[PDB]
């Protein structure tokens, strides 16, 4: 009946995935073509990768990201005069094997904090445990199964600006205006040893060393401070291994990547890359024309949870745990077959820069222009294909993580957007706003999927648990809220 076409399958790198193959238009659904590609690649029936396909419109420079209900008509609409003897290039984008359901309603409101919540993060193990940091000088651990307080972590004498679980879930770290970092046991609620002292001013951000890189029988932890330095701590002994010095202004943000590089952004308007093992400066990016206050790595989500994944399988031994954590990172961070993390940074002049240190050094991949006010948060999607940026201009913007191109606005908030958080399958993003709402966005369609009123005041912090089940939020009204499907 309907005709056929030759298909040229290329991956995200632009490399041909299989030899050219003929496909009937009658069979040309995304599902069937995805099934076909999996088959051509020799995959096992039970190990198929779900593909979506960007269609390269023959005769022009347009790439369609949303697969059409009828391929033939899409081609004819675009003036493909001979659809039956033109090779169609299809970019294959692998999708998550699992699906995260959009949260849709309040699960629990839990009061406890006496001042605003500034930070919140789920355990990398499951959504059953949540941590928050507050201007009441405490962190808290919450039982999200029942919506009850679990532990109050007291000891800090200034605002808790950040909480961060160790990637294996065994520790929680907190940083504070009191110039200290504290490490806690989230199962017992007890502080581990003494406070980490050394910074001269407020401690602004934390980054755990990825689990698969731990050595000397200890976890390592990086802290960024207003004192313009980063310190690397040995967690077991509380000793500072390295002081990363050179920034001429406050180090507002810090990330620790899967090849043992540390990344920093500063009010001295620079973004720097450091060798964590040697404590030496590797790259100094000076493109920004204003204070840098936020950075993100393409690999953040996979490094956030070490060996913990959607399978809920935890390997038995230290070695196996390391191996699985490493394998997950390398599978997620390889571009063109080589491990290569990307970095995005934001300055107060509304600008973002996209970096590929491995392949570009200090020449940025792209400059990301479009926001009409400051960026308050930026996150790569877990699969590293997209960037979401939360703006003071009431918008969240989506960008291509490969070339920095603007893709679409997420419009809906009526006040500054303070944070965003990706679902683990890269399909959804949740945002929290000054307007006291959370909104869940369908990334593929660009549309509001779910609107979540409830908070009595501004929302400062949001997280989407890696297992997908719960979203958490907190802000000026002091009570934590969890959200469920």
From Swiss-Prot:
Keywords of this protein's UniProt record, alphabetized?
A: Nucleus, Repeat, Ribosome biogenesis, WD repeat
Ranges where the record places region Ubiquitin-like (UBL) domain: 2-96
What ranges cover the WD repeats? 112-152, 155-194, 198-245, 246-284, 319-365, 370-409, 412-451, 454-485
Say which domain of life the source belongs to. Answer: Eukaryota
- Its main localization is nucleus
Give the UniProt record's GO annotations in the biological process aspect: ribosomal large subunit assembly
Name the InterPro entries for this protein. G-protein_beta_WD-40_rep, WD40/YVTN_repeat-like_dom_sf, WD40_repeat_CS, WD40_repeat_dom_sf, WD40_rpt
One Gene Ontology cellular component annotation?
Answer: nucleolus
Q: Quaternary state and partners of this protein? A: Associates with the pre-60S ribosomal particle. Interacts (via WD repeats) with uL18. Interacts (via UBL domain) with MDN1 (via VWFA/MIDAS domain). Interacts (via WD repeats) with NSA2.
Role this protein plays: Involved in ribosome biogenesis. Required for processing and efficient intra-nuclear transport of pre-60S ribosomal subunits. Interacts with the AAA-ATPase Midasin, which is essential for the ATP-dependent dissociation of a group of nonribosomal factors from the pre-60S particle.
Q: Which family does it belong to?
A: Belongs to the NLE1/RSA4 family.
Q: What is this protein called?
A: Ribosome assembly protein 4
